[PDB]
Amino acid sequence: VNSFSGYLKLTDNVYIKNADIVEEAKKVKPTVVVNAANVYLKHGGGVAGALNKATNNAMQVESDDYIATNGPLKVGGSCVLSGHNLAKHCLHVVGPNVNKGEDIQLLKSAYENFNQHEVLLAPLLSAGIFGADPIHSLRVCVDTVRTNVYLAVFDKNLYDKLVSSFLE
Ligand SMILES: CCNC(=O)c1cc2c(N[C@H](c3ccc4c(c3)S(=O)(=O)CCC4)C3CC3)ncnc2[nH]1
Numbered sequence: 001v002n003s004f005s006g007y008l009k010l011t012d013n014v015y016i017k018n019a020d021i022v023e024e025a026k027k028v029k030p031t032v033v034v035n036a037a038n039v040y041l042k043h044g045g046g047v048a049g050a051l052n053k054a055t056n057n058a059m060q061v062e063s064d065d066y067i068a069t070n071g072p073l074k075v076g077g078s079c080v081l082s083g084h085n086l087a088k089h090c091l092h093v094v095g096p097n098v099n100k101g102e103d104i105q106l107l108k109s110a111y112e113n114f115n116q117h118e119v120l121l122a123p124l125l126s127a128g129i130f131g132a133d134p135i136h137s138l139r140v141c142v143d144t145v146r147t148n149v150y151l152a153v154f155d156k157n158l159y160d161k162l163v164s165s166f167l168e
Contacts, residue, residue, distance in 0.1 A: 001029045002119050004150045010166055013148050014141060018159035021047060021123050021152040022054045025086035033087035034114070034122035037094050039072040047123045055084040075102055076109030091117065099131035107137060111144040119148040134158060135165050
């Protein structure tokens with residue numbers, strides 16, 4: 001477990017790689033994989049959809065049962081559930097969707113959830129269709145997370161732009 005390889009070291013506790021989070025979870029077998037979730041845990045597309053399809057829908061079925069009894073999460077909040085075949089646990093974290101008018105300040109709260117786990121495999125929160133500035137999301141991660149985080153960014157151009165910007 002936690003056999004991470006090929007990552008660029010940004011800080012003593014933040015690492016980054018141009019990779020698909022699904023393929024990283026299969027090779028690494030991490031203790032925790034982070035899902036970029038929405039408050040009702042509907043894993044239809046993007047990172048959430050990719051993780052769910054890689055569990056052959058077991059993640060969505062588990063999430064629907066959680067929602068039925070507990071209700072939706074809050075933006076900036078999180079929920080630990082099974083990681084199924086991809087990891088021991090899945091930490092479902094809700095980052096702000098700035099394309100839907102949600103507060104970017106809550107991105108700090110979203111990353112604070114990582115501090116409860118010694119090591120995690122994660123996507124860059126609120127990137128993609130959530131519309132947050134990816135350079136800013138990396139800065140919030142670096143300034144907030146104290147535990148070991150391995151960021152998988154599935155876009156070579158975005159990866160190159162983030163590394164170049166961080167090295168300034
Ligand atoms: C082939 C199956 N895998 C995938 O489709 C996949 C997609 C993917 C990925 N996408 C990034 C990303 C990061 C955060 C968020 C999104 C998307 S979202 O559009 O889902 C909205 C929620 C926040 C994207 C490059 C910035 N990052 C790592 N591993 C991946 N794997």
